[PDB]
Amino acid sequence: DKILPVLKDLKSPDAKSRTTAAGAIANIVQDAKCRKLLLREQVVHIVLTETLTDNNIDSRAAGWEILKVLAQEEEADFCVHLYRLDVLTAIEHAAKAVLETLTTSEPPFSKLLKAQQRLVWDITGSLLVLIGLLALARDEIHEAVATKQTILRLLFRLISADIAPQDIYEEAISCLTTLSEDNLKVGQAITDDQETHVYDVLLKLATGTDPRAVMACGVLHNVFTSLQWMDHSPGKDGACDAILIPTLTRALEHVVPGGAKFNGDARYANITLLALVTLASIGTDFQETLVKGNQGDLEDLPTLRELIQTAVPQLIRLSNLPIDSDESLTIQSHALSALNNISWTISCLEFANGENANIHNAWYPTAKKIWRKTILPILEADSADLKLATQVTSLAWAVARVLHGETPTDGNPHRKFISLYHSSKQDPFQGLGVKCIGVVGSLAHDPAPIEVNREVGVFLVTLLRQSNNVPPAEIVEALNQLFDIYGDEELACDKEVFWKDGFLKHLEEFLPKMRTLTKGIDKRTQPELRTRADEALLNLGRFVQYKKKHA
């Protein structure tokens, strides 16, 4: 009943009164409830069709914020409704005005009035935030936004000139990070700009002493992946993820225990969390360098070199430290995510026989440190998380796929992972149980302690004897682990455990059981597990013959 008469004014033919109302609705649309009523009376329709194209720049700044605020307070869909109403054109036209104001030499920007200047920033802030929101909405909106050259060139102009207020600067980087995430066109836009040289400006800033260096790394990493500027195919001046890693690592160097918060702290969301998340993405995306490299002293792999020598030491430090506070509870978590992604990618390499020897010597000692300094301390205090339990087992599984029973036996870790499996009993292959099977299986290969092998082997086989309630994926992993371990009659454990404890009978007994559960899996929902299980029974049959043939 207060807002009803406010809106009438917005359509008033007296520019003074409309422009005032706009002012008030931008505040009033903040509190909930006043916003439900404001949206039902056609606020979005007026603002779009009248207020954003009004002649007065105070009116247009309120218009944009009314949309900004609404976009923020509303659910994600509200943006699609905005997209459909063609807000993007409104934004593009307004964007083209900011640039004309910013890049004009007639009036010209620095010679504007203080209050006049502040208004151009208001409008930019509303624009920036909006673009950010719609790009997050759906893939089509993302590719509609990225299409708009005016929008892009606005972004390059802001990042490049560095005259904008910092809150505007950071929002512009944020935007371009989202726009550039797995988007080829944007990456080409950034690297093809001879007008403002955003790419050069970004490089210089991502490499130097500036406080916002990591922020520029987040943009550049996205560009390097999208354009496949990688170790096999370096970008401009040998550019690839390699050059971002030291900056990203010097960012972890500064975070030390006992200083969570301050009176003035402009770096914490950006400075620390961003660096970790990006290191972990770098971990993920290096996997694509290995695949693409193949279709065509880690000197040839600088990204991998930097990851191991520089990135990983700081991540083991960060994984270790408390944890005094919830915020450092998140630093640990993210540190563990990066270790995880790197360790996993690396373990996606063939190291059997002599294969990839160069990379195996680079990694192996580090893999041992990760296990002793990270995985083991954390495993020492049983309680209490499931989320965290799950994170350490994933990493342990990645590190033990390379270590292969060379992996340290210290706190008898296999027994802990084994107890983890059973107790956490209370996409098939992402089960934590699968993870328990795979790590314990991997550290039990030769040349491990023959009793460590006996336990692990007994657990794996028990799994089959009592397959009555084990999830089919966990059966497949168990069978692969066993084949992986006891398929060599020269290994002490083949005679010392496989034969000594007659593993062969359980395997021969399990064959029928294994055929019915396989056919129990819908090929059509879902394929992978089915075809994977078919290979395990296949291998299971071939495995029961080969030994059958050996005392």
């Binding site: 193949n294 995880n340 996993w344 292959f429």
Partner: peptide
Amino acid sequence: AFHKLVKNSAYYSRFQTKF
């Protein structure tokens, strides 16, 4: 530039944590 991968590498891309 050729580095031999594991037999079923894509099976393991699920263990990457994304952002």
